[PDB]
Amino acid sequence: MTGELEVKNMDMKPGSTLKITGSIADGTDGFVINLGQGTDKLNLHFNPRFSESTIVCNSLDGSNWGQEQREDHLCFSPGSEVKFTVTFESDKFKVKLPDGHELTFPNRLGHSHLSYLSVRGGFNMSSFKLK
Amino acid sequence: ELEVKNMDMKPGSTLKITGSIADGTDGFVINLGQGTDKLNLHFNPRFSESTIVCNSLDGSNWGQEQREDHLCFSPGSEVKFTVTFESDKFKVKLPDGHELTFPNRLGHSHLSYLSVRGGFNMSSFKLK
Ligand SMILES: OC[C@H]1O[C@@H](O[C@H]2[C@H](O)[C@@H](O)[C@@H](O)O[C@@H]2CO)[C@H](O)[C@@H](O)[C@H]1O
Structure with missing residues (x-):
């Protein structure tokens, strides 16, 4: 739990x-960036899964995960330094990946801050x- | 605010x-430690008193405050602070160039x- 910033x-x-x-740890099979209204209201669950060669995006509403959106453009690696830019718009999230590629994921949980x-x-x- | x-x-x-320092505010706080009741560094610019007050908090007990009269920044401004954690002390670089120090009283755990x-x-x- 140390280093898993909240x-x-x-x-x-x-x-x-x-x-x-x-920095992505050497040998890691994946990581998660969560962004939302709270721990059980995640507008954006952003989960690059190196082990599955994909990025999984989802929402979390209480105890219920939404429908996954998978992006096969996982072109950064364990060991990488990475930068991401997340843009929050009322209707959607844009995530700019290290190589400039942008993914979009609908905002499912309203436009509260x-x-x-x-x-x-x-x-x-x-x-x-x-x- | 932000935790x-x-x-x-x-x-x-x-x-x-x-x-950014809120317009008209009397001051603000940056706390750095292990939890809401274990604060290695409590850093508190007070515009009213023209001073920066620092202290430590261990459970319900505050240590002895230290005051730095070198307060030269203002509400309305975007400012930067640089805090260096050393085993024996904190160094805080203020936006005017001045550097203050505060003893680390809570012993060295991250x-x-x-x-x-x-x-x-x-x-x-x-x-x-
Ligand atoms: O949807 C995001 C969450 O997925 C969980 O893993 C899923 C898996 O992706 C999916 O294939 C499904 O069938 O079952 C698994 C568990 O629900 C993760 O455990 C979770 O961390 C989220 O990433």
């Missing part, structure tokens, strides 16, 4: 961007920047 | 914080907790 009481409004930098960010797995978040 | 948990700040590491309170809207966090 950020609370953010005030990310629609139209804002979150820039995240971190996002207050919660957490990391799980083999990702050491070294910086974040809210704009 | 960060499960950090892994070890001695030698540096934490850079950027944020810091896992950061919290900002009062008139400060943190926009950026960087750990090295």
Whole structure:
């Protein structure tokens, strides 16, 4: 649990961007960036799964995961330094990947401000920047 | 306000914080430690008193405050603070160039907790 950062009481409004930098642990099979209203309200569950050569995006509403959206464009690796830019719009999230490729994921949970960010797995978040 | 948990700040590491000070506020707080009741560093610019007050908190017991009269930044500004955690002390670089220090009284375990309170809207966090 050490290093699995949790950020609370953010005030990310629609139209804002979150820039995240971190290091991916050598030999890790995947990691998670969660962004939402709270621990059981995740608008964006962003889960690169190196082990499955895919990025899994989903929402979490209470105890119920939504329908997964899988993106096969997993072109960064264990050991990589990576930067991501997440854009929160009322209707959708845009995630800009390290190579400039952008994924889009619908916002399923309304446009209340996002207050919660957490990391799980083999990702050491070294910086974040809210704009 | 903003809380960060499960950090892994070890001695030698540096934490850079950027944020905007709320218009008209009397001051704000940056806390750094292991939890809401274990604060190695409580950093509190107070515009009213023209001073920066620092202290430690161990359970319900506060230590002896230290005051730095070198407060030269203002509400309305986006400012940057750089905190260096060493085993014996914290160094805080202020936006005017001045550097203050505060003893580390809670002994050297990594810091896992950061919290900002009062008139400060943190926009950026960087750990090295
Ligand atoms: O949907 C995101 C969550 O998936 C969980 O793993 C799923 C798996 O992706 C899927 O194939 C399904 O059939 O069952 C698994 C468990 O529900 C993860 O455990 C979870 O962390 C989320 O990533």
